[PDB]
Amino acid sequence: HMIILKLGGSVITRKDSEEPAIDRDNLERIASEIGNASPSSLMIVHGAGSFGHPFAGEYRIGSEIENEEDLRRRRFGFALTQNWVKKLNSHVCDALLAEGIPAVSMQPSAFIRAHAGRISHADISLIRSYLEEGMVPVVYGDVVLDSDRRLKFSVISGDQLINHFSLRLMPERVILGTDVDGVYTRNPKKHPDARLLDVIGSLDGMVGKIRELLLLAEKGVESEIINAAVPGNIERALLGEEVRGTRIT
Amino acid sequence: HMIILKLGGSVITRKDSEEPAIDRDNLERIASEIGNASPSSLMIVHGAGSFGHPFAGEYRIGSEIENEEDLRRRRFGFALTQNWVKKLNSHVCDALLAEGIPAVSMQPSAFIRAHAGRISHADISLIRSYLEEGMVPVVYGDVVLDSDRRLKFSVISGDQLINHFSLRLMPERVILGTDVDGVYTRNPKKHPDARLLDVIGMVGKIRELLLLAEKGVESEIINAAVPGNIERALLGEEVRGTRI
Ligand SMILES: Nc1ncnc2c1ncn2[C@@H]1O[C@H](COP(=O)(O)OP(=O)(O)O)[C@@H](O)[C@H]1O
Ligand SMILES: Nc1ncnc2c1ncn2[C@@H]1O[C@H](COP(=O)(O)OP(=O)(O)O)[C@@H](O)[C@H]1O
């Protein structure tokens, strides 16, 4: 009766970044909520937010590579980015453990490959054993090697992970905790008449997310998008007591 | 042409605080030495030192489970230990990266399994790829799921890692950077008459290297606490210690 839950990198990281930083209050609270609901089976994915975007964008990870001088620089940037995202994960696991959750991380760059930006290989047997042993596996948006020889590496997002693993683990619920209430007709931060959709079916950042999810819903698994920045929402979603959000179908 | 280098947990960490902590001076120095040597193909293993043993010990990981209280507990500890040793590795990578070294961790507990405390399976195709793209895979001592149902989790040490991967990748040289000058005839730390051996843990450490010795590969023990040994060994130059 398993649940897969994504924590958007925007909810748990802070952008007013001298350096990358946790949103400690959002993080410790969400952990508390995961503890209070105590799901029977759980897997978590989290976005990188300020520990990821800034570095991978600086180095253009996932973009064609023109010359050997590009290449040498990007190879360094892949490594620097992977360490930054690992440090966020270690904060993540700190907060979970602090709440008694046996969070076990699985670094995507150590067992996942991409081809042209799409997950090409992911071992799922180890994740399954962690789940079987009663642990909480935690994956996260990360940089991975890309067998497309123009690219060499890609960023695999929290959202591709949620899609790839929910397809294959066939969880009962897929919950995406984001920093807005749901999907809207329009970017509700640029458009005053954006309306909150309670369910989605086609196209009618956050677009990226929906495209990914629409692949998943089309294979018969539905997800829910809720605001994690709103107290209790994670705890209620994990309890199965409907919350404000959008279902993708 | 490749070299696998271990950095012993005692060398890079210090037992010395309520909190685990790095030996910042050894670690940045060692990073700088690896930087200066610029080996053309390298992989690093490192020990967990004080980020590892304390938690593993508290929870008795890799010893037999009686009770479901025992069980539930060892679970929590597996998770706690893996996080602590991940934070160390993140320090190790910071230090490598500060030297311009494209070091990429590969968390063992994300692709390696054990059986009865021994390394059972590990895909080595991502490691190869990382080496092919000129990066420096960094693995480390960690807790791994163990398919012996009596144990469930084992600590797989940096020594087992160096033995397991050297056999499968067949590196040019293997170099173990420890906190003493070599293997002695006895524990130098409480036998004033222990004599350095120039050719042949270390009850354990040696046990493992012997397996490897036997199957055709020979390693070198050196003191990585001493300035320049790592750099000199990385460059192929005479350095004091023991051949195996
Ligand atoms: N149609 C939309 N509905 C909801 N939010 C949208 C939409 N279009 C753009 N957005 C923006 O997308 C953001 C959420 O996506 P993102 O920053 O990737 O979240 P996460 O950190 O959860 O991945 C929202 O903060 C919002 O500003
Ligand atoms: N016969 C021996 N020769 C050398 N050192 C020994 C011997 N027996 C015990 N030791 C102890 O083992 C220590 C190094 O072992 P180990 O903890 O495996 O190092 P690392 O942290 O580099 O893996 C030495 O500092 C020494 O105190």
Topology:
2 copies of one chain form a homodimer.
Chain A: E1 3-7, H1 9-12, E2 13-14, E3 21-22, H2 24-37, E4 42-46, H3 53-59, H4 68-97, E5 103-105, E6 112-115, E7 118-122, H5 125-132, E8 136-140, E9 142-145, E10 153-156, H6 158-169, E11 173-178, E12 199-200, H7 206-218, E13 223-227, H8 233-239, E14 245-248
Parallel strand pairs in A: 1-4, 1-11, 4-8, 5-8, 11-13, 12-14
Antiparallel strand pairs in A: 2-3, 6-7, 9-10, 13-14
Helix pairs in contact in A: 2-8, 3-4, 6-7
The structure holds adenosine-5'-diphosphate (ADP) (2 copies).
Site (Transition state stabilizer) (chain A): 15
Binding site for ATP (chain A): 6-10, 49, 179, 184-189, 205, 209
Subunit structure (chain A): Homodimer.
Notable characteristics:
8-stranded mixed sheet, 249 residues, alpha/beta, 8 helices, mevalonate biosynthesis isoprenoid, Carbamate kinase, 14 strands, binds adenosine-5'-diphosphate, homodimer, transferase
